[PDB]
Design a protein around this nucleic acid. Structure first.
Ligand SMILES: [Mg+2]
Ligand SMILES: [Mg+2]
Ligand SMILES: [Mg+2]
Ligand SMILES: [Mg+2]
Ligand SMILES: [Mg+2]
Ligand SMILES: [Mg+2]
Ligand SMILES: [Mg+2]
Ligand SMILES: [Mg+2]
Ligand SMILES: [Mg+2]
Ligand SMILES: [Mg+2]
Ligand SMILES: [Mg+2]
Ligand SMILES: [Mg+2]
Ligand SMILES: [Mg+2]
Ligand SMILES: [Mg+2]
Ligand SMILES: [Mg+2]
Ligand SMILES: [Mg+2]
Ligand SMILES: [Mg+2]
Ligand SMILES: [Mg+2]
Ligand SMILES: [Mg+2]
Ligand SMILES: [Mg+2]
Ligand SMILES: [Mg+2]
Ligand SMILES: [Mg+2]
Ligand SMILES: [Mg+2]
Ligand SMILES: [Mg+2]
Ligand SMILES: [Mg+2]
Ligand SMILES: [Mg+2]
Ligand SMILES: [Mg+2]
Ligand SMILES: [Mg+2]
Ligand SMILES: [Mg+2]
Ligand SMILES: [Mg+2]
Ligand SMILES: [Mg+2]
Ligand SMILES: [Mg+2]
Ligand SMILES: [Mg+2]
Ligand SMILES: [Mg+2]
Ligand SMILES: [Mg+2]
Ligand SMILES: [Mg+2]
Ligand SMILES: [Mg+2]
Ligand SMILES: [Mg+2]
Ligand SMILES: [Mg+2]
Ligand SMILES: [Mg+2]
Ligand SMILES: [Mg+2]
Ligand SMILES: [Mg+2]
Ligand SMILES: [Mg+2]
Ligand SMILES: [Mg+2]
Ligand SMILES: [Mg+2]
Ligand SMILES: [Mg+2]
Ligand SMILES: [Mg+2]
Ligand SMILES: [Mg+2]
Ligand SMILES: [Mg+2]
Lengths: 95, 227, 157, 15, 122, 46
RNA sequence: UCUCCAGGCAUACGCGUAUAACAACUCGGAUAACCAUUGUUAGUUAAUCAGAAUAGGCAAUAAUCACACUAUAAAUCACCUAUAACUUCUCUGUUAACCCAACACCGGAAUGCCUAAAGGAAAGAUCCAAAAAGAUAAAAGGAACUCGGCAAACAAGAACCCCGCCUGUUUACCAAAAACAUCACCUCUAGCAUUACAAGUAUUAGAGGCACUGCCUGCCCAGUGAUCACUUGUUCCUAGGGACUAUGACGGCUAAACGAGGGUCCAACUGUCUCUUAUCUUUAAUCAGUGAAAUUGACCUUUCAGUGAAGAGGCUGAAAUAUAAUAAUAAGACGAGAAGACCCUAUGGAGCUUAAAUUAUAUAACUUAUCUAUUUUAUAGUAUAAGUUUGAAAUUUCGGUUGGGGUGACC
RNA sequence: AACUAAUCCUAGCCCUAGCCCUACACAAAUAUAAUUAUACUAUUAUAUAAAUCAAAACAUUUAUCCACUAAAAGUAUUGGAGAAAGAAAUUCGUAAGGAGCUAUAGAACUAGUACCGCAAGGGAAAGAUGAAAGACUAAUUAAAAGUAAGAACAAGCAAAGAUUAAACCUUGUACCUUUUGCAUAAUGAACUAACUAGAAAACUUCUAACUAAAAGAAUUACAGCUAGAAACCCCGAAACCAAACGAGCUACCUAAAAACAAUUUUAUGAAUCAACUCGUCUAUGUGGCAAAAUAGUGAGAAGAUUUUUAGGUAGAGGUGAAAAGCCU
């Protein structure tokens, strides 16, 4: 990680994260299942069904990605017609 | 810094002082190994263009007198001073050449082959096929560059349509024009090969330094298995 | 002078490479100069000369940078000075021939003073200026004499 | 081994 | 171990190395290693006759010194050449061509003592 | 044998090798002089 | 004046006032006297010693007492033809005990002449201890010493084996040899000029290997008829038909000689030894002057048994015990110093080797193009580009587990 | 009741701000072996920066090294799509001082000097009276280690509890680092003075301003937003690349030179043996006379000999009768 870049003096986003994970404004992260496109001819139908899903990240993994991405990737985005509109907030959670 | 001693523009019989290179290039690095040291030697300028007319003289056959047959330290063969007209020059001496003999330099080309005594330059066309020759030259007027070592001789194999085939000492056959001039006979010091050096110090006199102490085929991919 | 990737893939080694122009030596005739020069010339220049419809047109048209040669710039000054002065040395004893050449290249005519300072480098221009302004110091004797005469003449006036 | 030394300065002390 | 800081002089070096101490040459070395002195190249001291000289090395304290006025080209011109031109101007016998009449030298060439470049020493 | 006496002084050898004229012969030698002038050295060469 | 030692005076290179007198007595000489030290003043005197005009023409015949005498390695401006100038003494080096080695260093330093006529002093005063170093002498014996006759000797003679043919050369500062070179012999490459080779040309030049020398000795040498025909062989045309085919990669070894080579043996010899001693010098010790180094947590620094990590001056249990110096010994202080040794580790290196991976306008080559000549397509070449083929080289790498290793293996 | 010593304040320096420059030093000399008054032989930078290092190796690659502030924005893009790199469009702008040093500090500097290296090059240390020295150079301090004044007195990590009493009596296995959380180990320290090593605000906590809004332009927001405070060391390789500098040592070569007595063979890389060259053996030395010597003993000594002078070959290299030997 570049903690202080020469030209600007700012932290730099890791683009390996931007191309694999989606952050919801609450703080959750979405990911795919590794191998969901690999050797599908020998996987069971139930196995394939699990792979197609989108999965969440843990507290540690979420903490890591928040260190490898900059605040710009942690803002509110008002996209019209967004298919993730309802998932950016947590409701009826006491904890 | 390194200026070759070969700076004399004008021919002269007087011996010219030499400088040896020890094998080093003009940059000071060795380009040939084993060369260094030896007795101080004086260069005696040799004329290999036998038929050279004297200044303001007609280009016709002329004779010259063999004054002396000296020993040249810069060559295997022994040179002979030849005096004719009003000039003196050094020439390579034939095996049987003796002082006081007269040799013939003849540019004239004869249609009919004429027997030639040893040492008389004649055009290759003039020489009958099979005569022993030396000091042969590739092109007329180029001086001699072949068969000029002690005891060497060349054979005039074939003269056809103004072209002559000469069997060089290495047995290589080289074709030249019949206009080329080569004197008859083998070069002197025939017994050069028979000498025995005997002592290592003798070669060190000649300038030959000691050698160093440092002590294939690719099989094709199919042939790797069998080896 | 650059680098290339062996086999044209960036995962291979980086190898030094120099690309050279296929220089050619040819003979060219300048109408304005009426002289034939032998010059090392690339095939690109030959096409440019053809597109310029003549060697003389090529030199005059091409700017200083595109030309990319000090020898060419000298030719530019020589041709420009020839046209600027209408020198009779061009094809002497044949005025008809001389007029044709000058008229054909009349478009490039420029003032004589400007033409002189064409293609010169800073050092050559500096040397040219220094020579022009070089003068031996005036004797003070004369300078005082001029002042004295003027004062005396004014007083008499 | 190494080696370095210092000078015996004249040091005139007459003030 | 050679002393770099001492001056390079002829006392140092081998026999072959030699150089002058600044003495002006007075002759020529001809062929065969023979020196031929030239009388003209030997300076000659022009010494005046001091008989009847009224000036001594030291000056009296009582004598009062004057105001220092470094001589200038203009001052010399006014003293020497200006009066001649001024009188000539009134008479009208003056022209630019004959400035030499008042002492002007067009070129220093031909003068025994050339003003510039100086061909005579102190 | 006994080392330590490598220096065999010869003024002709010294001046040819590290002299003024020798240094000025090459630009690489002239840049040796140029740096020495920058530092302030008492002697620029032999 | 006496005693004794035996490289000295110049020159060159170098050094740069260390020269000489006076005056000082801080510093330098490793201590004194005295100065080589400090300050001041001086100094080395050259027409002979030493250092620093032009254009042509043309040289076959060494040296060595050069005569004889031979040899081989083949060997040091002058004199002429013409032009130009017609009577000069300046400049610089010159001293010393000296230079290269941090030093007033038992070292290094070229030439000429000479070998004492020149140049010098091993002992500051003492004292006679051990140990150590050097010299000389030995009753009887004579290598019985020892890894070995190392060293020493009133000896310095003789033969042998091995290895290299010989003279020679090499790791400056641990190996001088059997290793390298070497003559002779053998193999490979090259048919040629104006900077090595070489101003040379196959009896030559480069590259590399190997002791040579007579003698045994490799294979290789179509088959049968007999200089002749067939059978083969090799090619084509289709199993036929034509066409064509007239001792050298190896040993013994000469065989002698020569060796500061590696081993032996005899003889003499001897303090090597049985068996050590005596005298002398040096060193030591004492008086005087001068004055280092490694080392050092602190130390008021004991013995024995026990315990402990092959381990105890210091802990545990007994014991011993006025304080300090001087000179000796080397048992301990896992005594002090060194870039020494050993096994293992590092996603630490660097040298070499290529059958490692990746490249590779070093070279050479060829192909298509560009391009200039040419002939109606054509064969030439090529200040270039794109390929293909070699590789002189460059870059980078050394998986893990198997009580070490090669082989098996295993992950 | 004091020796060694200690105290000291200004010499200069550091970072900014302003500012292009027009400091190019009588006369004489210097590119010849610089600083030598005159002719000879004439005089001229460079093809692409590499590598280290990072990628926990390394082979593509690796910010600075190598064109106005702030914002867009660490965004689009680029990348063994890894480490990492990283725009623009378009907006915005009229721009003399010290919470620095004060002689181991600040520059290396009293000086690029002394000294060291053949050269390139490397590189110091230190001073201190007063208004007056034309007032006999002051002061000032039980003050560092070290000594002296004043050696020691059975017994022991040197002390502690003590005691009438300094020592006797009792108790007590140096310190740090380090090993397992153990040392009678193993490292490091003779002692004194001075110097000598944790640094950044993405997330969090704490404290305030305003509050569906906060912020002095671009930012964030379903109680947020703004500001404050709060954080992540030192010393040390073998190496690698670039460019200079070195063949006065040494390997080799070129040129110009020099030395070799006597004796016997003969007519010589033959013999005996000095000068001279070398360096087999033993002994001494071992911070030595010596960073390779001395005493003896040995090898060659007309030759492939030794020596002198000047020049040439330079590190991807040179040289090598090959020891991976030499090249200060
Ligand atoms: Mg061999
Ligand atoms: Mg790279
Ligand atoms: Mg040295
Ligand atoms: Mg020497
Ligand atoms: Mg004296
Ligand atoms: Mg005296
Ligand atoms: Mg001494
Ligand atoms: Mg004195
Ligand atoms: Mg003389
Ligand atoms: Mg003298
Ligand atoms: Mg004495
Ligand atoms: Mg004594
Ligand atoms: Mg005896
Ligand atoms: Mg005895
Ligand atoms: Mg025995
Ligand atoms: Mg012996
Ligand atoms: Mg031998
Ligand atoms: Mg030998
Ligand atoms: Mg050795
Ligand atoms: Mg030897
Ligand atoms: Mg030895
Ligand atoms: Mg031997
Ligand atoms: Mg016996
Ligand atoms: Mg003692
Ligand atoms: Mg004493
Ligand atoms: Mg005590
Ligand atoms: Mg005690
Ligand atoms: Mg004990
Ligand atoms: Mg015990
Ligand atoms: Mg005890
Ligand atoms: Mg002991
Ligand atoms: Mg590497
Ligand atoms: Mg890395
Ligand atoms: Mg590695
Ligand atoms: Mg300082
Ligand atoms: Mg400093
Ligand atoms: Mg004290
Ligand atoms: Mg007690
Ligand atoms: Mg210690
Ligand atoms: Mg570090
Ligand atoms: Mg030399
Ligand atoms: Mg050698
Ligand atoms: Mg003799
Ligand atoms: Mg030797
Ligand atoms: Mg002998
Ligand atoms: Mg012998
Ligand atoms: Mg001999
Ligand atoms: Mg070897
Ligand atoms: Mg060295």
């Amino acid at each position: 990680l570049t903690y202080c870049s020469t030209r600007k003096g700012k932290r730099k986003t890791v683009k390996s994260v931007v191309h694999r994970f989606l952050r919801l404004h609450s703080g959750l992260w979405l990911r795919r299942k590794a191998g969901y496109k690999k050797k599908l001819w020998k996987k069971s139908t139930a196995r394939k069904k699990r792979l197609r899903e989108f999965v969440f990240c843990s507290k540690t993994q979420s903490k890591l990605l928040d260190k490898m991405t900059t605040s710009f990737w942690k803002r509110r985005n008002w996209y019209a017609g967004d298919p993730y509109q309802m998932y950016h907030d947590r409701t009826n959670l006491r904890v | 810094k390194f200026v070759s001693w070969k700076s004399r523009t004008k021919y002269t019989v007087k011996p010219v002082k030499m400088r040896k290179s020890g094998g080093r290039d003009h940059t000071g690095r060795i380009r040939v190994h084993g060369i260094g040291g030896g007795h101080k030697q004086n260069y005696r300028m040799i004329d290999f263009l036998r038929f050279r007319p004297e200044k303001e003289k007609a280009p016709e056959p002329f004779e010259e007198k063999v004054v002396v047959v000296r020993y040249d330290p810069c060559r295997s063969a022994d040179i002979a001073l030849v005096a004719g007209g009003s000039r003196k020059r050094w020439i390579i001496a034939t095996e049987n050449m003796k002082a006081g003999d007269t040799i013939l330099n003849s540019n004239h080309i004869g249609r009919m082959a004429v027997a030639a005594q040893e040492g008389d330059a004649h055009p290759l066309g003039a020489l009958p096929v099979g005569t022993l020759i030396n000091n042969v030259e590739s092109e007329p007027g180029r001086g001699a560059q072949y068969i000029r070592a002690a005891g060497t001789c060349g054979v005039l194999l074939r003269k056809v349509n103004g072209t002559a085939i000469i069997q060089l000492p290495s047995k290589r056959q080289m074709q030249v024009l019949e206009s080329c001039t080569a004197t008859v006979g083998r070069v002197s010091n025939v017994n050069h090969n028979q000498r025995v050096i005997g002592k290592a110090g003798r070669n060190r006199w000649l300038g030959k330094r000691p050698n160093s102490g440092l002590w294939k085929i690719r099989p094709l991919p199919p042939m790797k298995s069998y080896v | 002078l650059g680098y290339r990737y062996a086999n044209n893939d960036k995962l291979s080694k980086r190898v030094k490479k120099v690309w050279k122009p296929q220089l050619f030596t040819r003979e060219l005739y300048s109408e304005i100069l009426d002289k034939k020069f032998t010059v090392t010339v690339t095939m690109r220049t030959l096409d440019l000369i053809d597109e310029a419809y003549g060697f003389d047109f090529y030199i005059l048209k091409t700017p200083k940078e595109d030309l990319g040669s000090k020898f060419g710039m000298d030719l530019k000054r020589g041709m420009l000075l020839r046209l600027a002065r209408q020198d009779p040395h061009l094809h002497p004893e044949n005025p008809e021939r001389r007029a044709a050449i000058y008229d054909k290249y009349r478009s490039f005519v420029i003032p004589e003073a400007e033409a002189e300072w064409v293609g010169l480098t800073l050092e050559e221009a500096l040397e040219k200026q220094r020579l022009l302004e070089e003068k031996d110091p005036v004797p003070l004797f004369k300078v005082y004499v001029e002042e004295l005469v003027q004062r005396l003449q004014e007083q008499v006036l | 081994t190494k080696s370095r030394f210092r000078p015996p300065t004249p040091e005139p002390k007459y003030k | 171990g050679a002393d770099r800081m001492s001056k390079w002089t002829s006392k140092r070096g081998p026999r072959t190395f030699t150089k002058s101490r600044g003495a002006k040459k007075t002759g020529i070395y001809t062929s065969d290693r023979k020196f031929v002195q030239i009388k003209e190249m030997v300076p000659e001291f022009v010494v005046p006759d001091l008989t009847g000289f009224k000036l001594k090395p030291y000056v009296n304290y009582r004598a009062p010194a004057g105001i220092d006025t470094p001589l200038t080209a203009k001052a010399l011109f006014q003293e020497t050449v200006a009066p001649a031109i001024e009188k000539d101007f009134k008479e009208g016998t003056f022209d630019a061509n004959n400035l030499e009449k008042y002492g002007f030298e067009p070129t220093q060439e031909g003068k025994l003592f050339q003003l510039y470049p100086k061909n005579f020493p102190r | 044998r006994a080392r330590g006496n490598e220096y065999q002084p010869s003024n002709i050898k010294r001046k040819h090798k590290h002299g003024w004229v020798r240094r000025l012969s090459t630009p690489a030698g002239v840049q040796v002089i140029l740096r020495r002038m920058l530092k302030g050295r008492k002697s620029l060469s032999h």
